[PDB]
């Protein structure tokens, strides 16, 4: 699940999602 800020898109929570 992609975050709105693509700066947060890396893997801070997207990987876990």
């Amino acid at each position, epitope marked *: *699940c992609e975050p709105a800020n*693509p700066s947060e*898109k890396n893997s801070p929570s997207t990987q876990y999602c």
Partner: antibody, heavy 122, light 107 residues
């Protein structure tokens, strides 16, 4: 002094193509990420997408698929949006916006572009 | 997509009156955001995090709420407050905006 200047207004023809500028100044470009909002009398304000100029990483609203790509330039400190296959559905004001994921505890539109008004007709 | 709905559509407000608009969400949201937009110009950051005032914004503007129920509130209405106020969420991708509450001043 952190301006987010945008292009004025555009005439586009039905089923054509348009690229609009969004140039930045007063902050490290690559250190903040860039969004693109549509406004129309009806349906109001609609987020379209975003891009992180630290690499060119994106994200796209489903509703604008196959019509809203966000390319980014060399260090002319600028983001871009191309709209394709324009119908009179696309006559709108198009804002670009900058995000600070943190002013207090949330991601947040800090400064905005002036908005590019698009008229679609032949 | 969280659909954000605002009440009222038009808020009639006499100068110096205490009024309040509400932003309701389809699902739970962590924080609420508010803009002031005057016709012809871009939306202006007004409230960031349901409580905090963007720089420049007078402290007659106040804000509240949790879960799906939020409220921007102007303690004494002033002439320059005539604008449309939009709420906005970040929680669910895509970020979505209210349909806006237009503040009309009843001079």
């Amino acid at each position: 002094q952190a301006y987010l200047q945008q292009s004025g207004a555009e005439l586009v023809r039905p089923g054509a193509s348009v690229k609009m500028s969004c140039k930045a100044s007063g902050y490290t470009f690559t250190s903040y990420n860039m969004h693109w909002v549509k406004q129309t009398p009806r349906q109001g304000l609609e987020w379209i997408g975003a891009i992180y100029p630290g690499n060119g990483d994106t994200s796209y609203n489903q509703k604008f698929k196959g019509k809203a790509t966000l390319t980014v330039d060399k260090s002319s400190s600028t983001a871009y949006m191309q709209l394709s296959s324009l119908t009179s559905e696309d006559s709108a004001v198009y804002f670009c916006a900058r995000v600070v994921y943190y002013s207090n505890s949330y991601w947040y539109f800090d400064v905005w572009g002036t908005g590019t008004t698009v008229t679609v007709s032949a | 997509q969280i659909v954000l709905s605002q009440s009222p559509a038009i808020l009639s407000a006499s100068p110096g009156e205490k009024v309040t608009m509400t932003c309701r969400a389809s699902s739970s949201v962590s924080y609420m955001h508010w803009y002031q937009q005057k016709p012809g110009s871009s939306p202006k950051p007004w409230i960031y995090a349901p409580s905090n005032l963007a720089s420049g914004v007078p402290a007659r503007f106040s804000g509240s709420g949790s879960g799906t129920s939020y409220s921007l509130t102007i303690s004494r209405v002033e002439a320059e407050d005539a604008a449309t106020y939009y709420c906005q969420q970040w929680s669910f991708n895509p970020p979505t905006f209210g349909a806006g509450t237009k503040l009309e001043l009843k001079r």
